[PDB]
Amino acid sequence: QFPRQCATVEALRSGMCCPDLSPVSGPGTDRCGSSSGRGRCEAVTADSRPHSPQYPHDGRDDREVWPLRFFNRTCHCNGNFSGHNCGTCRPGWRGAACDQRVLIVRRNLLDLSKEEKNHFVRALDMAKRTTHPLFVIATRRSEEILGPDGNTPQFENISIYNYFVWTHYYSVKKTFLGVGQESFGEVDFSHEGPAFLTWHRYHLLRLEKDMQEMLQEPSFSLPYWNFATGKNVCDICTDDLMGSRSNFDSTLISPNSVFSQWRVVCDSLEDYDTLGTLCNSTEDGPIRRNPAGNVARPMVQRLPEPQDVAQCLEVGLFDTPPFYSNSTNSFRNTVEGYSDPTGKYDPAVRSLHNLAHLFLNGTGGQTHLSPNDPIFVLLHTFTDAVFDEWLRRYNADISTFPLENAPIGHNRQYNMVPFWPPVTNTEMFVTAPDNLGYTYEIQWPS
Ligand SMILES: *[C@@H]1O[C@H](CO[C@@H]2O[C@@H](C)[C@@H](O)[C@@H](O)[C@@H]2O)[C@@H](O[C@@H]2O[C@H](CO)[C@@H](O)[C@H](O)[C@H]2NC(C)=O)[C@H](O)[C@H]1NC(C)=O
Ligand SMILES: *[C@@H]1O[C@H](CO)[C@@H](O[C@@H]2O[C@H](CO)[C@@H](O)[C@H](O)[C@H]2NC(C)=O)[C@H](O)[C@H]1NC(C)=O
Ligand SMILES: *[C@@H]1O[C@H](CO)[C@@H](O[C@@H]2O[C@H](CO)[C@@H](O)[C@H](O)[C@H]2NC(C)=O)[C@H](O)[C@H]1NC(C)=O
Ligand SMILES: *[C@@H]1O[C@H](CO)[C@@H](O[C@@H]2O[C@H](CO)[C@@H](O)[C@H](O)[C@H]2NC(C)=O)[C@H](O)[C@H]1NC(C)=O
Ligand SMILES: *[C@@H]1O[C@H](CO[C@@H]2O[C@@H](C)[C@@H](O)[C@@H](O)[C@@H]2O)[C@@H](O)[C@H](O)[C@H]1NC(C)=O
Ligand SMILES: [Zn+2]
Ligand SMILES: [Zn+2]
Ligand SMILES: [Zn+2]
Known part of the structure; x- marks a missing residue:
């Protein structure tokens, strides 16, 4: 979403989000750090290729051809510089010149020391309470983005972790067609399509970076949850970690965990989908969690088995037509969880990533809502670890990641919605240790 210095009237009118970095000659004189060698303001590259016919409402949704309905000029940073104003470094790099390498290690949460486990729980909780230093979120669609008087931009501050909840919401929300019309919901810019793994990869990377800066700890890393144990229970749902079950309400988190205090954002879909607004920063109910408790649906009362992970890594094509939740022999659809671990589509099956949710x-x-439960972070770093192992094992073969006719938002060169600056699925379709500055301490069944 957008840097707060682009959520102004002037920026939204000009169509340009190219903020200053260190301007000594007055405003606008160091856009994108161009006085240094760090970058330049330039035209946005945005995918214009066709999408599947599932989405018939071309022209109605601000997420189409992202980010052109808000900005047509962005910062492009030179070399290994990065960031909205090119004031930081590409992933895996540090220093004033972005020339010093770093490689962080994402570990199994249950292998951390007692001090590390406590450091991670408190870091999450500080992220839930700490205002994001850079990003503000929209509460209205673009038509209304500048307010009632046309001069009051409809953006709100939001916390580091709630921003993480919000960008996921914005990517899955229904297309609003107008008051009294039923909002269109056969659309998903981050699920049920090839961009699932790369979208959630960037999602995690953005949170890890925000928390490194929140903590002033450059090597801080997001741990993972090996949910592929076949267990009856949630082995990370304990009060030194993600919270055990409350003894007073089986759907709440134990009051002896900080996470029983969390209040969720974006739970008011009936307001958003009928009035045309967007999720804002006002929190509401508490986290609901009841592991293995869906008695009406026995298939989701046990986690994936370890062999489910080994089987899905035997699927050699990243994705297969029609590049959707009914693709078969698709690795993306297998680990996302709409196929059984071997690749066999079945409308009734739910496996791996979907099963864990x-x-x-x-x-x-x-x-x-699901990022509101902080188990999301660890569920997805593990899903990303499976993806990273697939990328090593099959040499990052992007050839099946379609350039066109995927569900809208999932073309390979689509800018993943709504991340800022624009970032394509291709930029994430790389083995992480060599290219994104992190690796997983993990071993795979065989
Ligand atoms: C680049 O953008 C400018 C600014 O327009 C804004 O860009 C988007 C956020 C979109 O929502 C527009 O409504 C915004 O106005 C464009 O310049 C304006 O173009 C409109 C018509 O497209 C015109 O009515 C205004 O007078 C123009 N104002 C200015 C200051 O240029 C420009 O056309 C865009 N260039 C592209 C898309 O190539
Ligand atoms: C996967 O699902 C899609 C969407 O349901 C199927 O594609 C077509 O979808 C349109 C609407 O988008 C329907 O009107 C058609 O009936 C579908 N085409 C047909 C049946 O030829 C797609 O066929 C599905 N793929 C499967 C089941 O393998
Ligand atoms: C932030 O979102 C909440 C939830 O949609 C908004 O509150 C709702 O507003 C509608 C009508 O405006 C009321 O009918 C509901 O009672 C409200 N919900 C709650 C939980 O109070 C809220 O107005 C939004 N904030 C802004 C600035 O738009
Ligand atoms: C959690 O699981 C329970 C079942 O254990 C779900 O409650 C059932 O929901 C279905 C569909 O809405 C109903 O037909 C049943 O009558 C419900 N049973 C009970 C005992 O409530 C519940 O929807 C699940 N909730 C979430 C968020 O997953
Ligand atoms: C958002 O909040 C602004 C506060 O700006 C800064 O935000 C972080 C970095 C905190 O450290 C805080 O102390 C800082 O002052 C307000 O000025 C403003 O009301 C809000 N802006 C918008 C666009 O909603
Ligand atoms: Zn360029
Ligand atoms: Zn998701
Ligand atoms: Zn998920």
């Missing part, structure tokens, strides 16, 4: 039988199993 629904196992939680609560907030974590609802697409617009």
Whole structure:
């Protein structure tokens, strides 16, 4: 979403989000750090290729051809510089010149020391309470983005972790067609399509970076949850970690965990989908979680088995037509969880990543809300570890990642919605240790 210095009237009118970095000659004189060698303001590269016919409403949704309905000029940073104003470094690099390498290690959460486990829980909680220093979120669609008087931009501050909840919501929300019309929901810019793995990769990378800066700890890393144990229970749902079950309400988190204090954002879909607004920064209910508790649906009362991970890594094509939740022999669809681990599509099956979400039988199993449960972070670093192992094992073969006719948002060169600056699925389709500055301490079944 957008840097707060682009959420102004002047920026939104000009169509340009190219903020200053260190301007000594007055405003506008160091856009993108161009006085240094760090970058320049330039025209946005945005995918214009066709999408699947599932989405018939071309012209109605601000997420189409992202980010052109808000900005047509962005910062392009030179070399290994990066950031909205080119004031920081590409992933895996540090220093004033972005020339010193760093490689952080994402570890199994259960292998951390007692001091590390406590450091991670408190870091998450500080992120839930700390205002994001850079990004503000929209509360209205672009038509209304500048307010009632046309001079009051409809952006709100939001916390580091709630921003993480919001960008996921914005990517899955229904297309609003107008008051009294039923909003269109056969659309998803981050799921049920080839961009699932790369979208959630960037999502995690953005949170890890924000928390490194929040903590002033450059080597801080996001741990993962090996949910592929076949267990009856949530082995990270304990009060030194993500919270055990409350003894007073089986759907709430134990009051002896900080996460019982969290209040969720974006749970008011009936307001958003009928009035045409967007999720804002006002929190509401608490986290609901009830592992293995979906008695109406026995298939989601047990986690994926270890062999499910080994089987899905035997699927050699990243994705297969029609590049959707009913693709077969698609690695992306297998690990996302709409196929069984071998690749066989079945409308009734839910495996791996999907199975882990629904196992939680609560907030974590609802697409617009699930990042509100912080188990999301660890569920997705593990899903990303499977993806990273696939990228090594099959030499990052992007050839099946379609350039066109994928569901809207999922063309290979689409800018993943709504990340800023524009970032394509291709930029994330790389083995992480060599290219993104992190690796997983993990071993795979065989
Ligand atoms: C680049 O953008 C400018 C600014 O227009 C804004 O860009 C988007 C956020 C979109 O929502 C527009 O409504 C915004 O106005 C464009 O310049 C304006 O173009 C419009 C018509 O497209 C015109 O009515 C205004 O007078 C123009 N104002 C200015 C200051 O230029 C420009 O056309 C865009 N260039 C592209 C898309 O190539
Ligand atoms: C996967 O699902 C899609 C969407 O349901 C199927 O594609 C077509 O979808 C349109 C609407 O987008 C329907 O009107 C058609 O009936 C579908 N085409 C047909 C049946 O030829 C797609 O066929 C599905 N793929 C499967 C089941 O393998
Ligand atoms: C932030 O979102 C909440 C939830 O949609 C908005 O509050 C709702 O507003 C509608 C009508 O405006 C009321 O009918 C509901 O009672 C409100 N919900 C709650 C939980 O109070 C809120 O107005 C939004 N904030 C802004 C600035 O738009
Ligand atoms: C959590 O699981 C329970 C079942 O254990 C779900 O409650 C059932 O929901 C279905 C569909 O809405 C109903 O037909 C049943 O009557 C419900 N049973 C009970 C006992 O409530 C519940 O929807 C799940 N919630 C989440 C968020 O996953
Ligand atoms: C958002 O909040 C602004 C506060 O700006 C800064 O935000 C972080 C970095 C905190 O450290 C805080 O102390 C800082 O002052 C307000 O000025 C403003 O009301 C809000 N702006 C918008 C666009 O909503
Ligand atoms: Zn360039
Ligand atoms: Zn998701
Ligand atoms: Zn998920």
